Design an enzyme around this catalytic site. Structure first.
Site, PDB file in Angstrom:
ATOM      1  N   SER D  96      -2.987 -13.418   7.230  1.00 36.80           N
ATOM      2  CA  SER D  96      -2.687 -12.274   8.091  1.00 36.80           C
ATOM      3  C   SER D  96      -3.848 -11.315   8.278  1.00 36.80           C
ATOM      4  O   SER D  96      -4.218 -11.008   9.417  1.00 36.80           O
ATOM      5  CB  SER D  96      -1.499 -11.498   7.508  1.00 36.80           C
ATOM      6  OG  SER D  96      -1.876 -10.802   6.332  1.00 36.80           O
ATOM      7  N   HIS D 121       0.143 -14.089  11.922  1.00 35.70           N
ATOM      8  CA  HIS D 121       1.556 -13.752  12.019  1.00 35.70           C
ATOM      9  C   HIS D 121       1.687 -12.235  12.068  1.00 35.70           C
ATOM     10  O   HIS D 121       0.747 -11.497  11.761  1.00 35.70           O
ATOM     11  CB  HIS D 121       2.391 -14.375  10.888  1.00 35.70           C
ATOM     12  CG  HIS D 121       1.972 -13.978   9.508  1.00 35.70           C
ATOM     13  ND1 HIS D 121       1.297 -14.832   8.664  1.00 35.70           N
ATOM     14  CD2 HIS D 121       2.177 -12.839   8.805  1.00 35.70           C
ATOM     15  CE1 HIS D 121       1.082 -14.229   7.509  1.00 35.70           C
ATOM     16  NE2 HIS D 121       1.607 -13.018   7.568  1.00 35.70           N
TER      17      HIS D 121
END
Ligand SMILES: Nc1ncnc2c1ncn2[C@@H]1O[C@H](COP(=O)(O)OP(=O)(O)OP(=O)(O)O)[C@@H](O)[C@H]1O
Ligand SMILES: Nc1ncnc2c1ncn2[C@@H]1O[C@H](COP(=O)(O)OP(=O)(O)O)[C@@H](O)[C@H]1O
Ligand SMILES: [Mg+2]
Ligand SMILES: [Mg+2]
Lengths: 340, 191, 331, 191
Positions: D96, D121
């Protein structure tokens, strides 16, 4: 010949601005020193020992000036040898002997003049605490108290070397001991940190105002100087920091005041050099921040005068050049009366 | 692991940790939850730097999710007591206590990065005991709440009523929003 | 003594030196004062002013000698250019320190009238740096004080202006130490990796202290109230100098080709590129010599090989190092 | 255990750990979950290297499965603020925050090993409380999601509508796929 300590003080005061404490000390010191060279009669009074002085003041305080100015009052050979160059024997670097050697070069290789000479060894603080430290101090110890010279011959065998005893010469020592203020602060009110502490006023030329007034031998030993070395020098002179109030009183008051000297050169062409009270004060502040003090005035002034000093000669009928506070900083240019 | 660093000064070479090296530049770091142990270090650091140069400004970076109110007060009270200006540059996040320190910096020297979140929340307290103790411990948490509101109004300049209204619930403010509110002076983007 | 005004001094000297006018301004008034002031002091009030000695500090091929020569080109008084390496102990190990006064006897024409206004100049004074060495400095300093000493012919040492200039090696590093460094922060001014790499650290701002740190005798270091600052070179000044001298490098190159009967045609465009090559090698004005000398090697090995080579045209590509000399050989 | 290394400089021999020795060459390591303490070390390292040489490039190796958003933003904002160009080299994983810090490097200085894996994400968050508090925090997590998508679009050049569509679910991208996407510039294979 043997001028009264007060007269010496007044003469030295002509240039020095605000060193009264040291002034008297330095005055009496030399006065009695030369009385010993004078009092050579055989009446069981030759035993008199010399008392070397240890001048401590922030850089640019006026230490050198006092030594140099006083040298003129004596009218005898004087010299200034840095302490950093000197290094203990057995490693490359200047040898303690060299100090006498250079000192004698000013004396013209005259033994009588040599014994009546004064030394101003500078940056003594540098040699504090295997090499370049105690070694140099140990060697110097004998030299300052008693030693025979070994100065090689000039121009032109090994026996040619000359000799003289270093028991008459007054070995004055000047040094800017950085950090001594903290050692003297530990004597009383050690607190540096905290709410109820003695936190330093600032990081400008105000810090050491009277911090050396309470200097004792113990602190100098803690600083790093050998105990014996501190003992050798019984007298410890103290100089001020030459702050903005001093710098304002030093730009016009002294007989050799930069303004006077600059005015003389300007007067030749016919321009009446003028300065404003606030203008002179402005330069002082600029020098203090620059950390150049005494030595910063000339440069600063040259940056404010030289500009118009290259024009003034080519200009005619010029009567005055008013230097304004603005002119000192980089806002305005020197006001000049182009016509009458 | 903390990497070492060498200053390579004229006097010689000395090994300083990454945090100690920056401390020589009058920089203090506040990371993690605020507590008595970590806050005391900041106090000692602020006082120590005052002696070296009581005129040079100090830069205090704040990235913390909050913590003890008492511990934070020792820092704020210390920053105002000392003479040097204590700059603040919020990096990351600045919760209720962190925001108070960010607002306590010298005028015109409070900063924050673009992607920085500054939250304001009421003081958190917990106590158990008899009704008399609860009444006694309720005035203290209410009196403290008034002191913190006055501090923000003093630095930010906003009226006290607005501070109480905003502190009632969590309010996230970006860099630009915080400037209008008075919490900071400038949002820095690039050198 | 010529003794013109600062304006005239600078303007008349600019004619032969380009790029050193900044330092000139200072030196102009400096020497102007010295002659005028001393000659006609008229017992000035509270006389304190010492001989207005001016220091000269510039790197090699900076035009120290050129500024020294142009200064002495129109000066009727003698200049007696001398050296600091030649000096040794006082007739013990080699040459004596009275040889500087001996060079003055030659220029002054044995005239005391000229001797007193002798502008004693020295070059490469930085080769006696302490580490003979320091001994020569002290024996040299003695004469700087203005101590009348014969060589044998009595010589007036008072009022002798000193414009001595040395190519001090490692001067910038010492003044670089004095310079402060930047901080490490989000709101701090990191000014540079290093500080004496953008402008000449030495010749922008100097104080006597910096000179003492270099390893020079403090008395001599604090003997000159005035100082100077020579600029290494300039890009604009490098194209003018290319053909400014009577026997300029480019001129001499064409003259050498003309000995065989070939013209050295050169393009203005090429000049710009040439300046950059010299600025990169950082060897001064003299440095440019090597760049073209190598470039012409091919032309100095092609023109002889092919006879009747009327001229040679040099383009910017040739200085770039890609193109080959465009031989204009014809009939 | 961390091994020791000897530089053997001209002045004399010095001993530095493996990490400190590489730090001398303007190299910073990002390993493990991103959190305030480890992130603060990176910030300190970036500033220190800036003062040493504000012109020489910096290389930031990123091997992390993600972590705190606030901690990551402090690094990203610091990389762009400083003058030197902070290169980025993926050495195997960025879920991330690793890809936000891998795609936030100077143009032409974002690399990835041959078998590295990069994912992207939306930021995960966890909070509990009253409905009013939930609505306030929901807006905050929605605002962050937009600011993060804007950053990727700026560095990758892809439109915001595509980034939001790709960040709804976990999307794995290989070295070759990332170059076309715009996350990186070149795939280092051999010297
Ligand atoms: N300021 C200048 N203007 C024009 N030409 C210059 C200048 N400085 C150097 N030169 C060139 O340098 C050559 C002569 O170099 P010179 O022997 O004067 O070096 P130098 O400057 O005396 O060295 P140093 O500074 O070490 O004494 C000449 O060809 C001249 O064209
Ligand atoms: N009160 C003063 N009046 C005139 N000049 C001063 C004064 N104080 C210092 N100076 C100048 O400062 C220079 C530096 O000498 P000094 O201050 O004695 O110690 P240092 O040489 O270590 O700075 C001297 O050349 C002197 O001309
Ligand atoms: Mg002095
Ligand atoms: Mg020459």
């Amino acid at each position: 010949k043997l001028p009264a300590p007060k007269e010496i003080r007044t003469i030295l005061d002509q240039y020095v601005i605000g060193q009264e404490r040291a002034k008297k000390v330095l005055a009496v010191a030399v006065y009695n020193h030369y009385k010993r060279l004078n009092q050579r009669d055989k009446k069981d009074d030759i035993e008199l020992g010399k008392s070397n002085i240890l001048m401590i003041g922030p850089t640019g305080s006026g230490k050198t000036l006092l030594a140099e100015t006083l040298a003129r009052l004596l009218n005898v050979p004087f010299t200034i040898a840095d302490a950093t160059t000197l290094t203990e024997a057995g490693y490359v670097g200047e040898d303690v002997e060299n100090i006498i050697q250079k000192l004698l070069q000013k004396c013209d290789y005259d033994v009588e003049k040599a014994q009546m000479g004064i030394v101003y060894i500078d940056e003594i603080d540098k040699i504090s605490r295997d090499v370049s430290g105690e070694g140099v101090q140990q060697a110097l110890l004998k030299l300052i108290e008693g030693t025979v010279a070994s100065v090689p011959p000039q121009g032109g065998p090994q026996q040619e070397f000359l000799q003289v005893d270093t028991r008459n010469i007054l070995f004055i020592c000047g040094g800017a001991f950085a950090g001594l203020e903290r050692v003297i602060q530990n004597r009383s009110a050690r607190g540096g940190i905290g709410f109820n502490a003695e936190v330093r006023s600032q990081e400008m030329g105000k810090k050491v105002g009277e911090a050396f007034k309470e200097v004792e031998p113990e602190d100098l030993v803690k600083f790093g100087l050998i105990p014996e070395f501190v003992g050798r020098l019984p007298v410890i002179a103290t100089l001020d920091e030459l702050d903005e109030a001093a710098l304002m009183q030093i730009l016009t008051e002294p007989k050799n005041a930069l303004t006077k000297q600059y005015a003389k050169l300007f007067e030749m062409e016919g321009v009446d050099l003028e300065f404003r009270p606030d203008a002179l004060k402005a330069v002082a502040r600029k020098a203090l921040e620059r950390k150049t003090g005494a030595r910063g005035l000339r440069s600063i002034l040259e940056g404010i005068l030289l500009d118009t000093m290259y024009e003034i000669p080519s200009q005619q009928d010029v009567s005055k050049v008013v230097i304004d506070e603005s002119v000192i900083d980089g806002s305005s240019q020197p006001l000049m009366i182009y016509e009458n | 692991l903390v990497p070492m660093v060498v200053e390579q000064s004229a006097r010689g070479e000395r090994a300083y940790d990454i945090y100690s090296r920056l401390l020589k530049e009058r920089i203090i770091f506040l990371v993690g939850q605020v507590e008595d142990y970590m806050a005391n270090l900041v106090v000692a650091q602020l006082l120590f730097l005052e002696a070296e140069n009581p005129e040079k400004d100090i830069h205090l970076y704040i990235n913390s999710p909050g913590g003890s109110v008492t511990a934070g007060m020792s820092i704020y009270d210390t920053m105002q007591f000392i003479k040097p200006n204590v700059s603040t540059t919020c990096i990351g996040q600045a919760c209720s206590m962190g925001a108070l320190l960010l607002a306590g910096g010298a005028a015109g020297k409070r900063y924050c990065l673009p992607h920085s979140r500054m939250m304001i929340h009421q003081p958190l307290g917990g106590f158990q005991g008899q009704a008399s103790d609860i009444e006694i411990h309720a005035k203290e948490i209410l009196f403290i709440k008034e002191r913190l509101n006055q501090i923000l109004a003093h630095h930010t300049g906003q009226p006290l009523d607005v501070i109480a209204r905003d502190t009632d619930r969590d309010r996230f403010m970006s860099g630009d929003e915080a400037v209008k509110y008075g919490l900071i002076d400038k949002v820095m983007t690039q050198r």
